[PDB]
Amino acid sequence: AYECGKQGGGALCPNNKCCSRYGYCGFGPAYCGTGCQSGGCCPGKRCGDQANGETCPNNLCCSEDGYCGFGSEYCGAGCQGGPCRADKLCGQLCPDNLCCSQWGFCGLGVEFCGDGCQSGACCSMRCGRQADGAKCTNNYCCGASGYCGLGGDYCGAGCQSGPCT
Amino acid sequence: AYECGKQGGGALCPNNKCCSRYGYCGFGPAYCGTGCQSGGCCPGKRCGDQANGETCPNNLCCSEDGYCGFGSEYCGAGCQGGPCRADKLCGQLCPDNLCCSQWGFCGLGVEFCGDGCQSGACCSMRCGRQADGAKCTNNYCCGASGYCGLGGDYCGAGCQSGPCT
Ligand SMILES: CC(=O)N[C@@H]1[C@@H](O)[C@H](O)[C@@H](CO)O[C@H]1O
Ligand SMILES: CC(=O)N[C@@H]1[C@@H](O)[C@H](O)[C@@H](CO)O[C@H]1O
Ligand SMILES: CC(=O)N[C@@H]1[C@@H](O)[C@H](O)[C@@H](CO)O[C@H]1O
Known part of the structure; x- marks a missing residue:
């Protein structure tokens, strides 16, 4: 089975392993060279x-x-x-699902994603009926229990708002 | 089909998506909270x-x-x-397969991994017959054509040294 890249459903390799043009993880020219999809490509x-x-x-x-x-x-x-x-300012979404802290900086970890998290991968941003109709940011899905997230648990059954399926 | 973590062959999720305790990618408490394996876990x-x-x-x-x-x-x-x-010094291999440049700093990209690369995910480091029995660093494999790397193409058949077969 493929490990990474478009052949591997967009998965990344661990530990900066290069994803070859064929969708497998490794190092050296065959992985990190021409066609490298992710990891420590060279160039x-x-x-x-x-x-x-x-x-x-x-x-x-x-x-x-x-x-x-x-x-x-x-x-x-x-x-x-x-x-x-x-430092990366926000208010304006952060790139790559980084949390926009209450202070308006981008990062990950509780200081950014916890209390006061404005957007991105917030720990527990409430939404839906449980939050009086509040919407999720980043086009996340509002789950059944009224938390913002992505994946089947939030976009699947019970999904209240966002890009439900 | 598991996506990530211990269930998914150690794969990571893209764009900081959390890998749940069950090996699926997403955001929100179900993925990022208790049992989160990787990505933007919270905490x-x-x-x-x-x-x-x-x-x-x-x-x-x-x-x-x-x-x-x-x-x-x-x-x-x-x-x-x-x-x-x-800046991150090396000589003390770089963590997570980062290249130790000729100048003794860790990084990725040609300046680190290209000409003069000492260790880590070097672009092209010769080994085996083709390099006078020179061994690979980082416990990589020496491919059949005498290049240092990991993955099937280097650790598989023709492998000369390192964790072969
Ligand atoms: C949690 C948070 O946003 N902390 C930011 C910090 O990351 C940033 O370096 C600094 C800039 O002055 O402002 C702090 O409030
Ligand atoms: C490729 C390389 O090692 N470049 C380093 C650079 O990363 C480091 O910040 C600087 C510190 O003076 O020294 C350079 O030689
Ligand atoms: C360069 C490339 O992707 N070649 C892959 C190798 O990475 C992978 O490890 C192996 C399966 O073990 O199958 C080879 O075809």
């Missing part, structure tokens, strides 16, 4: 203003030159996306 | 000196307190792992 995948605004897979940083990677060259000055070293 | 997965050296999945930063996330609270002062904002 790095094209991103940002050099890929129609597509972000790097695996939370890699998008360099000023529009290549995916890590290190000061990628995350530092000129960084376009991913975990840049610069 | 963040335990990591670092507080979790037996475990690194964060999906290249999340490990906070001073040993939780996985993004933002200055996680990647900034006291960051233990992942794409911390501080």
Whole structure:
């Protein structure tokens, strides 16, 4: 069975393993070279203003030159996306489902996703009847019990609002 | 068909989607809460000196307190792992298959993994017959054509050294 990439239903490889053009995880030219779909591709995948605004897979940083990677060259000055070293403001959605904290910064973890979380992958944003009709952000689904999320548990049976199925 | 985690061959979800305790991708308490395996867990997965050296999945930063996330609270002062904002020295292999550049910093992309790459996910590191019996770093496999890597193409048939067959 395929492991990753379009052959593997969009899954990523663990530990920055490259997803080959054939949808398997590994390192070396056969995986990280021509056709590499994700992970530590070499060269790095094209991103940002050099890929129609597509972000790097695996939370890699998008360099000023529009290549995916890590290190000061990628995350530092000129960084376009991913975990840049610069604080990322929001209010305006965060990229890649990052939580917009009550303070208006993007991140993950309770400080961002917990109390006061405005959008993105909030821990427990209420919605639906339980929240008097409140809507979810990010086009998430409101589950049966009145929490915002994605996946079958929220978009499937009982789904109240959002892109239910 | 499981998607992720221990049920899904250790696969990650894309775009920070949480892998539920049951091996499916999504957001909300069912995925990100109790039992969350990877992605934007809430709270963040335990990591670092507080979790037996475990690194964060999906290249999340490990906070001073040993939780996985993004933002200055996680990647900034006291960051233990992942794409911390501080340059990351190596010589001490880089965590999670990051390339140790010729200059002794961890990263991904050609500047790190290309010419002069010492270890990690180097673009092209020769080995075996084709390189005078030179061994691969990181316990990678030496392919039949004398390139260092992982996955079937390197660890399968023709494998010269490392965790072959
Ligand atoms: C939870 C949160 O949003 N914390 C942010 C922090 O990430 C950011 O670095 C700082 C910028 O001054 O503002 C804090 O409030
Ligand atoms: C490819 C490489 O290692 N580049 C490093 C850079 O990541 C680091 O931030 C800088 C610190 O002075 O030194 C450079 O040589
Ligand atoms: C370069 C490539 O994708 N080749 C794959 C390899 O990655 C995978 O590990 C193997 C199954 O074990 O099947 C090969 O065809």
